Enzyme design. Structure first.
Site, PDB file in Angstrom:
ATOM      1  N   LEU A 351       0.665  -0.969   0.122  1.00  0.00           N
ATOM      2  CA  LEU A 351      -0.139   0.112   0.037  1.00  0.00           C
ATOM      3  C   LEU A 351       0.900   1.239   0.068  1.00  0.00           C
ATOM      4  O   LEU A 351       0.514   2.336  -0.434  1.00  0.00           O
ATOM      5  CB  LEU A 351      -0.921   0.213   1.291  1.00  0.00           C
ATOM      6  CG  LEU A 351      -2.274  -0.654   1.117  1.00  0.00           C
ATOM      7  CD1 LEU A 351      -2.801  -0.829   2.370  1.00  0.00           C
ATOM      8  CD2 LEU A 351      -3.231  -0.369   0.045  1.00  0.00           C
ATOM      9  N   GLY A 352       1.935   1.289   0.328  1.00  0.00           N
ATOM     10  CA  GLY A 352       3.018   2.367   0.486  1.00  0.00           C
ATOM     11  C   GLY A 352       3.822   2.679  -0.717  1.00  0.00           C
ATOM     12  O   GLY A 352       4.626   3.445  -0.651  1.00  0.00           O
TER      13      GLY A 352
END
Ligand code: HEM
Ligand SMILES: O=C(CCCC[C@@H]1SC[C@@H]2NC(=O)N[C@@H]21)NCCCCCCNC(=O)[C@]12C[C@H]3C[C@H](C[C@H](C3)C1)C2
Ligand SMILES: [K+]
Length: 407
Positions: A351-352
């Site tokens: 997600l990052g």
């Protein structure tokens, strides 16, 4: 006893390859190089190692991607080797499978995904610049210590609305977990970290603001409020997930650039190539190796796997696979189809990743603008370390400050 676990009866001897992910035999030649021995032509696509309790390893991109897609057979409930560490691990969403994972992932995405990143770009810029400028006239740094470590933790503090004064404490807590010296159990390290987070979540459920911890701790999952325990387990991951990955990746990158004046010059003369160069670096110096546990007996690519078997599915190996990228060890900023699974694959895809690319890109742009010419400190032998997140132990860099400029 070389601490090799007894070969389970379901594993055929011809698949046995005793690779040690925490101390690979070829380490001094570089960690990627050391792992890439699993891709030599006499090594099967799927092997069993008796090290670290015994576990499978998928050695090729095809199998790595396939297993990461198939969460029904390859569960994230126990994602680390050795088993005891995987079993203790309870971060969210990395310890969960779909469908439950999907709701927690959507909440995490609110705090680290695209629109948050487009917004943070200038605090990121400011931070990189002020760190680089503090080093520039010195003509030397320990890059890992002086730039790579302070950088992501300061960005996290900003996202999470945590005060500057907490940085040293939080650095200490996170280093305890991610670089264990063996004085602490993994569960003990986790507990210490949670002890810092428990009170702040309590505070922010009582009085929420607009920081990441406040969004997480007051979020909704499956149509009910998130528990304080769930919120703690998400914040733990949001803290650590962006730390050692970014620190170590930046260190691999800077080590490569320090040793390659021609690649430095390419990016100096053509800064527009920096986004593509980030992607080609992410492939070549890929560094994560986690994995999965079998939910049932399953035949996978001709091999009988047993319920409960662990499988290492190294994210790093896919992009190094000659079957995925021709001449894989070669760094070419104008490689045309750069394939890799450096950020993972399937339901847990990082997600990052968008934040990480901005950190890397800003770093390369801002560093090369101020300190275009640098090298490894004379006579230093750069030491690598291997594990779940592989890395560089230290990176002493030197430059002539006359060749530099304050912007
Ligand atoms: C070079 C930098 C990074 C690399 C190589 C990386 C790698 C990965 C990988 C391989 C996974 C999947 C693990 C699995 O499938 O078990 C993952 C997940 C995750 N990453 Fe990153 N990461 C990086 C930076 C970051 C940053 C800066 C953040 C921000 C906090 C972050 C947050 C997360 C989160 C929340 C997940 C879990 C997603 C889920 O379980 O649904 N990562 N990362
Ligand atoms: O728990 C461990 C592994 C234990 C290492 C010691 C081994 S055991 C025998 C051998 N002899 C020795 O002297 N030492 C070795 N620490 C590794 C660090 C654990 C990190 C946990 C936190 N990180 C995460 O949750 C992750 C989750 C996911 C996204 C991000 C990248 C990666 C995938 C890790 C963040
Ligand atoms: K677990």
């Amino acid at each position: 006893n070389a601490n090799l676990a007894p070969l389970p009866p379901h594993v055929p001897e011809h698949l046995v390859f005793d690779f040690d992910m925490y101390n690979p035999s070829n380490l001094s030649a570089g960690v990627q190089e050391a792992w890439a021995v699993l891709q030599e032509s006499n090594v099967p696509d799927l092997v069993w190692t008796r090290c670290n309790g015994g576990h499978w390893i998928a050695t090729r991109g095809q199998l790595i991607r396939e297993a990461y897609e198939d969460y029904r057979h390859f569960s994230s409930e126990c994602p680390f080797i050795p088993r005891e560490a995987g079993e203790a691990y309870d971060f969210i969403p990395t310890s969960m499978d779909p469908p439950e994972q999907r709701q927690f992932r959507a909440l995490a995405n609110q705090v680290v995904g695209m629109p948050v990143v487009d917004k943070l770009e200038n605090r990121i810029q400011e931070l990189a610049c002020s760190l680089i400028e503090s080093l520039r006239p010195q003509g030397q740094c320990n890059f890992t210590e002086d730039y790579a470590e302070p950088f992501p933790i300061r960005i996290f503090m900003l996202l999470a609305g945590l005060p500057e004064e907490d940085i040293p404490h939080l650095k200490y807590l996170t280093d305890q977990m991610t670089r264990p010296d063996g004085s602490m159990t993994f569960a003990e390290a986790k507990e210490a970290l949670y002890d810092y987070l428990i009170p702040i979540i309590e505070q922010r459920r009582q009085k929420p603001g607009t920081d990441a911890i406040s969004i997480v701790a007051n979020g909704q999952v499956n149509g009910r409020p998130i528990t304080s325990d769930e919120a703690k387990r998400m914040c733990g991951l949001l803290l650590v997930g962006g730390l050692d990955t970014v620190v170590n990746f930046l260190s691999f990158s800077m080590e490569f650039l320090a040793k390659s004046p021609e690649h430095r010059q390419e990016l100096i003369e053509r800064p527009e190539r920096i986004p593509a160069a980030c992607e080609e670096l992410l492939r070549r110096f890929s560094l994560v190796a986690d994995g999965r546990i079998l939910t049932s007996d399953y035949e996978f690519h001709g091999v009988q796997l047993k319920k409960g078997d662990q499988i290492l599915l190294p994210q790093m190996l896919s992009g190094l696979d000659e079957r995925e990228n021709a001449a894989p060890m070669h760094v070419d900023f104008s490689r045309q189809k750069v394939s890799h699974t450096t950020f993972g694959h399937g339901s847990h895809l990082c997600l990052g990743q968008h934040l990480a690319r901005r950190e890397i890109i800003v770093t390369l742009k801002e560093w090369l603008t101020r300190i275009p010419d640098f090298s490894i400190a004379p006579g230093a032998q750069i030491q690598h370390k291997s594990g779940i997140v592989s890395g560089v132990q230290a990176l002493p860099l030197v430059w002539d400050p006359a060749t530099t400029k304050a912007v």
